[PDB]
Design a protein around this ligand. Structure first.
Ligand SMILES: O=P(O)(O)O[C@H]1[C@@H](OP(=O)(O)O)[C@@H](OP(=O)(O)O)[C@@H](OP(=O)(O)O)[C@@H](OP(=O)(O)O)[C@H]1OP(=O)(O)O
Ligand SMILES: Nc1nc2c(ncn2[C@@H]2O[C@H](COP(=O)(O)OP(=O)(O)OP(=O)(O)O)[C@@H](O)[C@H]2O)c(=O)[nH]1
Ligand SMILES: [Mg+2]
Lengths: 77, 107, 51, 852, 272
């Protein structure tokens, strides 16, 4: 199991930002992060490629189709 | 007498020559409470023994309660095994006696 | 004695268990030694010191 | 901050960062029976998180039980809070506020104080003894306090090294313990949603001495690490509980193959543990190296030269690692406490959840009003200044920020038990070292300096200039009653002020201590038991006040009651010669006092439900059932006040005008009592008539209250009065042999053996009995010395019983220094306690009448 | 030099068995409740005698209870008497029953009972449900067997091959509770003088039904044991000078190996 993966699991319960392979940007609370980077989140703000925003209660994104995640700086220490 | 001595204890609490033998007046443990006179010496599950004292004497003078408990609780096979072990111990005891017999009971 | 003479063994002189008294007297000697050494040293000297 | 702290696995900065996120905070209380492993478990967690602090090889480091008395006696005396950051089996770190509580039954006040501010309970059960007195009492207390509960079965190595039981019978013992716990929980709780079973994760298996702790999940995780293809979650779901393994099919079944296969638990968890322990202990020099090589455990030659016990601890530590099963338990089955906030406010806060502040607190957000609640007071080693330990339910405490402190007697109308103070410094208390911080957000535990002055036992800290509709959290409700009583005086009367300061400090330190001054100028201390009072006296004489103090002989506090209805209906009139009261007294029905005390009925209820209960359960007429006025000295007291006044004789409006005054008089009379000035228990006072004057300045105030008390006293005295003795419930854990000796010792002290049974799976017996509290003095030492230390006993207050004699008998003659026979114990106890209190020599049934 | 040793567990078990007769087979200190050096220290400091314990001179000048002048506090018309407060109670709780407890020692409270089942019959398996153990009166969201959960081929219990118990398992378990030094497996070497054999004999209670002279012998032995323990002070920092090494370094002495009886006769003659 990879070092970055452990740090991801550490961010469960924190507010995180996720960009997909298609560049949609999802910000909200990370509920569950799986080993393969599958991500369950809640109370999301999504910012599309055109710039528009929306609001979602519950989402789940496949690990493969994630480009990256931004985690709190609370973890860095 | 015991009640009088008890009340006496309450009242008294509140209101050159070479001697090679300690005097009997120095004795402590001369109590009036039965709980402290007879103090229910320990029975270590019928398998622990006081140091020095003869093992056979200890077994003979023990309360026998644990022997009764063992005979009550033991299974039939457990009783058979224990009886065989006691038979082995008795054979060893008899052989030891026969070896270390006094000359008045030998040939 | 009162642990030795229990059971088949009765009162008698057959109990030899001497480590206890042996230790007692060796420990007494430990402390007596310097006193007697000093006394004999003061005695068998070229001179004598009293007072 | 920047203070000096010991080297640690985690970092204080990360701890503070976690403190802000309330979803990763777990408030847990470690409770259980005496000597069941709580302190050593906490020690081992501290060692895990602090690689420098280490437990001595042959001596056990505690890191709790810090006090000198604790270290000398070996028994924990005070609860200790520890805040740590523990990893999860998944690898995710959480913040754990663990309050380790004492196990002794006398010090249950510490446990209740910890419960008030905890959100979950971890119950430690010894694997050999099983369920015992304090375990039962603590299960009851936790379920009644509305806390989630989980269980850790400790000392499982006794089954292997002391009883050397077979794996299957050890499994049976553990299963029986689980069944006992579930039975008790069901008995004390109506809801069945709280079922304890290792399959669910509510039970863990630990051996704190040898550093072992695991759940089914963790021991499946070890298998997964060794072989990578298993889902340890499913493996854990299948391990326990009559699930036999078929190795030919590699599948588990509810049906036993071969009629000799062991359950999967025995096959996979228990048996290898047996093998590890046996190989380390018996074959350390022959095949131990091979077995450790098989396990993958490699230990250095310096290490493998250790004696058997250190070697066992080291090997088991290396094999198992961290205590991740405990963390899994707590994380899964204890609220967030964002989730657990609402029940806490529902149960504790006096203003109710429905209140606006109730909602503001049940939200539990750092950016809101300040509503700290302080339950403990910890004294600095010098013993001069105290620090308030409590939890923050809303807002954020800032160092230096002025606050408003409300004591237990504060009400939104009586705004005089409040006071503005200023908080100096804040600490995050690890057991033997305090982290100083600048602020503390809601949902955490904190030590506050500078707010000790205006509080005694419990307090609520809010903010000034706001929360004008602020009310105090309910004062702690204690698991028992402090009954034992002693008197204290200084040796040199010139040093009385020092003793007074010491008395105040001990009152603050011990939550359930009650210190008071009688009428004869005697200073009296109330405590639960002899060890409790011994510790109190030690602290008073050594820590707080440095003087020499004389202590009177122990004695208990009695109560007063009646056994039959008053011979005549009594009455009295005000000094004004108006406002005439007329009462009668009778005994209550069996169990009604228990209902009122245990809150099965509340006066706050609507009269509809109140009369419903009174009519349906205790066979009362609804007319009387809707005529209740008061419930004894407190809102929940064992004496009732009904007003039989028919509407035709007294204007009900006029009677209601002086209702409050008559209630005050009744409560004062019940609180004091005429026989010896002690509580009145189990009496029904019925107002048969009440002629009420017309004008408010002719009634009320200093007219009715004295008359009301005098009428209550006269009616009680007319009814045949009796004294009631406190009774202790004793549980002795003795060998199979000493039961007769226990019988004898108990019989010597008016005891009565209720039961005597064997402990399944152990060679010992439990003897449950009843003893009189006043005879209980020295009973435990009598037992231990008479039996040569093989029998041990713990006693606790159970119920009040009538003393055999008749108190108000002047025929009897008492000698000053003789143990009296039973038939006049009542008279002796009444007269001597009257002398102690400093009242007159004897009380006559006409003393408080208006006729004589 | 014969300074340190390290034995093996079978050796240690056999030595324990041979020494059995000198050892009391006690697995706890619950026996010594109010009968250990700390309780004796408290009783001495308070000038009281445990029934079976020693009896010293008052450490302080005893307060004569015929001296205090009947204050309001110690009035005897207020005291309810049920059981005479024995000396044992005051040693047990020195701060609740004594006025002026000075130089008093707190005593270790209870310790959990060590429920150890001594193995009488060697032939039995190490792990065996002994009759002494009270029987367990026998009497769960398990998954369904139809589920597809299958263990891999490699998987089997951690130590299947290793036997549960071996020939020397019960012996090791017993050694775990054997008294010192029989619980060790290594250490240093002491002096025959420094090893007392009956100290644990007279530290125990006197056997029941014994004569007064032996009872007083027990009491006085305990008295002197307590006195030594209390008066002990740590040794002082010497410089390690050796008398016989100095003699050997001198020229008037020489070494030889002789029979002890020969040396004894030699010393007798020289002393004469
Ligand atoms: O030395 P004591 O304790 O006084 O014992 C003396 C006697 O000793 P003496 O010959 O020095 O008077 C014997 O003891 P030993 O001589 O063997 O030391 C004898 O002991 P045994 O009968 O065991 O050989 C017996 O002691 P006891 O009666 O305790 O057995 C007796 O004591 P009495 O003076 O009471 O007769
Ligand atoms: N056999 C065995 N003994 C243990 C184990 N854990 C603790 N003990 C012993 O149990 C005794 C109780 O000590 P603690 O656990 O520290 O005391 P506690 O749990 O805090 O209980 P209190 O004293 O009431 O606070 C200690 O003397 C330990 O030696 C264990 O895992 N196995
Ligand atoms: Mg503890």
């Amino acid at each position: 199991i990879g070092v970055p993966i452990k740090v991801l699991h550490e961010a469960e319960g924190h507010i995180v930002t996720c960009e997909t392979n298609t560049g949609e940007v999802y910000r909200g609370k990370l509920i569950e992060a799986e080993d393969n980077m599958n991500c369950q989140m809640s109370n999301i703000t999504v910012t599309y490629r055109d710039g528009r925003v929306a609001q979602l209660e519950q989402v789940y994104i496949r690990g493969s189709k994630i480009r990256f995640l931004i985690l709190p700086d609370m973890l860095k220490n | 007498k015991d009640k009088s001595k008890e009340l006496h204890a309450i009242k008294e609490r509140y209101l050159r020559k070479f001697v090679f033998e300690w005097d009997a007046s120095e004795d402590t443990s001369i109590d009036y409470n039965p709980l402290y006179k007879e103090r229910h010496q320990v029975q270590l599950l019928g398998r622990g023994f006081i140091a020095g004292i003869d093992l056979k004497q200890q077994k003979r003078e023990q309360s026998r309660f644990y022997g009764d408990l063992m005979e009550k609780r033991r299974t039939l096979e457990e009783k058979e095994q224990e009886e065989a072990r006691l038979r082995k111990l008795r054979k060893k005891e008899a052989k030891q006696r026969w070896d270390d017999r006094h000359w008045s009971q030998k040939k | 004695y009162y642990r030795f003479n229990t059971g088949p063994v009765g009162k008698g002189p057959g109990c030899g268990f001497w480590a206890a008294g042996w230790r007692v007297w060796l420990f007494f000697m430990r402390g007596i030694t310097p006193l007697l050494e000093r006394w004999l040293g003061n005695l068998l000297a070229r001179q004598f010191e009293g007072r | 901050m920047e203070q000096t702290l010991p080297v640690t696995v985690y970092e204080m900065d990360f701890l503070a960062d976690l403190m802000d996120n309330s979803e990763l905070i777990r408030n847990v209380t470690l409770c259980g029976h005496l000597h069941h492993g709580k302190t050593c478990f906490v020690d081992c967690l501290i060692e895990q998180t602090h690689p420098e602090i280490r437990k001595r090889y042959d001596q056990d480091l505690c890191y709790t039980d810090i006090l000198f008395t604790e270290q000398e006696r070996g028994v924990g005396i005070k609860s200790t809070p520890v805040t740590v950051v523990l990893p999860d089996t998944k690898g995710k770190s959480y913040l754990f506020n663990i309050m380790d509580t004492p196990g002794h039954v006398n010090f249950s006040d510490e446990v209740t104080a910890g419960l008030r501010i905890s959100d979950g309970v971890v119950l430690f059960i010894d694997a050999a003894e099983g369920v015992m007195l304090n375990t039962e009492r603590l299960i009851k207390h936790a379920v009644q306090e509305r806390l989630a509960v989980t269980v850790c079965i400790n000392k499982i190595d006794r089954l292997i090294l002391e009883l050397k039981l077979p794996p299957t019978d050890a499994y049976y013992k553990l299963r029986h313990i689980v069944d006992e716990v579930n039975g008790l929980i069901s008995m004390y709780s109506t809801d069945e949603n709280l079922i304890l079973s290792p399959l669910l994760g509510n039970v863990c298996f630990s051996s704190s001495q040898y550093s072992i702790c695991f759940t089914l999940g963790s021991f499946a995780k070890i298998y997964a690490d060794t072989f990578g293809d298993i889902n340890y979650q499913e493996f854990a779901k299948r391990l326990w509980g009559d699930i036999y393994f078929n190795p030919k099919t590699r599948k588990f079944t509810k049906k036993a193959p071969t009629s000799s296969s062991q359950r999967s638990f025995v096959e996979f968890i228990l048996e290898p543990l047996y093998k590890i322990l046996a190989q380390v202990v018996g074959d350390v020099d022959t095949s131990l190296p091979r077995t450790l090589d098989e396990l993958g455990i490699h230990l250095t030659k310096e290490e493998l030269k250790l004696n058997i016990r250190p070697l066992l601890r080291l090997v088991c530590k290396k094999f198992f690692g961290e205590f991740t099963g405990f963390v899994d338990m707590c994380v899964q089955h204890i609220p967030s406490p964002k989730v657990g906030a609402k029940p806490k406010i529902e149960h504790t806060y006096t203003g109710g959840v429905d209140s606006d502040l109730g909602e503001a607190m049940s939200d539990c957000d750092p950016d809101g009003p300040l509503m700290c609640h302080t339950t403990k007071m910890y004294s600095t080693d010098d013993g001069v200044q105290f620090h308030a330990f409590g939890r923050v339910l809303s807002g954020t405490i800032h160092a230096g920020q002025p606050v408003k402190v409300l004591g237990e007697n504060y009400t939104l109308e009586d705004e005089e038990d409040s006071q503005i103070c200023t908080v100096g410094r804040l600490w995050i208390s690890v057991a033997r070292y305090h982290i100083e911080v600048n602020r503390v957000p809601a949902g955490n535990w904190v030590l506050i300096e500078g707010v000790d002055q205006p509080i005694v036992k419990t307090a609520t800290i809010t903010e000034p200039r706001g929360n004008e509709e602020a009310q105090i959290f309910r004062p702690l409700k204690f698991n028992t009653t402090s009954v034992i009583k002693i008197a204290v005086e200084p040796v040199n009367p010139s040093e009385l002020p020092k003793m007074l300061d010491g008395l105040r400090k001990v009152n603050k330190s011990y939550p359930s201590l009650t210190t008071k001054v009688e009428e004869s100028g005697e200073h009296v201390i109330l405590g639960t038991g002899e060890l409790y009072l011994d510790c109190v006296m030690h602290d008073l004489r050594k820590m707080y006040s440095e003087i020499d103090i004389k202590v009177a002989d122990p004695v208990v506090t009695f109560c007063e009651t009646v056994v039959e209805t008053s011979s005549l209906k009594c009455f009295a009139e005000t000094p004004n010669k108006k406002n005439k009261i007329t009462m009668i007294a009778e005994p209550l029905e069996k169990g009604l006092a228990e209902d009122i005390e245990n809150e099965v009925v509340q006066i706050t209820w609507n009269r509809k439900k109140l009369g419903e209960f009174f009519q349906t359960k205790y066979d009362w007429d609804l007319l009387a059932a809707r005529s209740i006025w008061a419930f004894g000295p407190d809102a929940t007291g064992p004496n009732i006040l009904v007003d039989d006044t028919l509407p035709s004789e007294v204007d009900k409006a006029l009677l209601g005008s002086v209702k409050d005054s008559i209630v005050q008089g009744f409560q004062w009379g019940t609180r004091e009592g005429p026989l010896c000035d002690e509580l009145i228990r189990n009496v029904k006072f019925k107002i048969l008539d009440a002629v009420v004057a017309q004008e408010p300045l002719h009634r009320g105030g200093g007219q009715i209250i004295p008359t009301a008390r005098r009428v209550v006293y006269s009616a009680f005295l007319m009814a045949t009065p009796r004294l009631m003795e406190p009774y202790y419930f004793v549980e002795v854990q003795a060998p199979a042999d000493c039961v007769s000796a226990v019988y004898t010792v108990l019989a010597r002290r008016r005891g009565h053996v209720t039961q005597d049974a064997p402990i399944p799976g152990s060679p010992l017996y439990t003897i449950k009995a009843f003893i009189p509290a006043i005879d209980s003095f020295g009973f435990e030492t009598d037992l231990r010395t008479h039996t040569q230390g093989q029998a041990f006993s713990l006693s606790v207050f159970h119920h009040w019983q009538i003393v055999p004699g008749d108190p108000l008998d002047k025929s009897i003659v008492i000698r000053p220094l003789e143990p009296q026979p039973a038939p006049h114990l009542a008279r002796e106890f009444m007269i001597k306690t009257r002398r102690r209190k400093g009242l007159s020599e004897d009380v006559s049934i006409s003393k408080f009448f208006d006729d004589p | 030099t014969y300074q340190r040793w390290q034995f093996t567990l079978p050796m240690m078990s056999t030595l324990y068995r041979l020494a059995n007769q000198l050892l009391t087979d006690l697995v706890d200190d619950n026996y010594f409740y109010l009968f250990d050096l700390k309780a004796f220290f408290t009783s001495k400091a308070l000038n009281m005698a445990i029934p079976g314990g020693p009896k010293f001179e008052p450490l302080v000048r005893d307060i004569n209870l015929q001296d205090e002048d009947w204050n309001e506090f110690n009035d005897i018309n207020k005291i309810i008497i049920r059981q005479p407060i024995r000396t044992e109670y005051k040693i047990a709780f020195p701060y609740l029953y004594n006025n002026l407890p000075h130089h008093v020692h707190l005593t270790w409270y209870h310790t959990p009972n060590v429920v150890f089942i001594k193995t009488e019959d060697p032939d039995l398996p190490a792990f065996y449900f002994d009759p002494l153990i009270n029987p367990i009166s026998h009497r769960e969201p398990l998954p369904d067997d139809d589920e597809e959960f299958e263990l891999p081929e490699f998987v089997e219990p951690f130590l299947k091959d290793t036997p549960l118990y071996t020939d020397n398992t019960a012996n090791g378990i017993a050694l775990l509770w054997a008294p010192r030094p029989f619980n060790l497996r290594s250490g240093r070497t002491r002096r025959a003088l420094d090893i007392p054999l009956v100290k644990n004999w007279y530290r125990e209670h006197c056997p029941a039904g014994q004569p007064v002279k032996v009872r007083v012998s027990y009491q006085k032995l305990l008295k002197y044991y307590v006195l030594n323990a209390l008066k002990h002070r740590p040794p002082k920092a010497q410089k390690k000078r050796y008398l016989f090494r100095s003699f050997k370094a001198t020229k008037f002495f020489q070494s030889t190996k002789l029979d002890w009886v020969e040396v004894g006769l030699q010393v007798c003659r020289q002393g004469y």
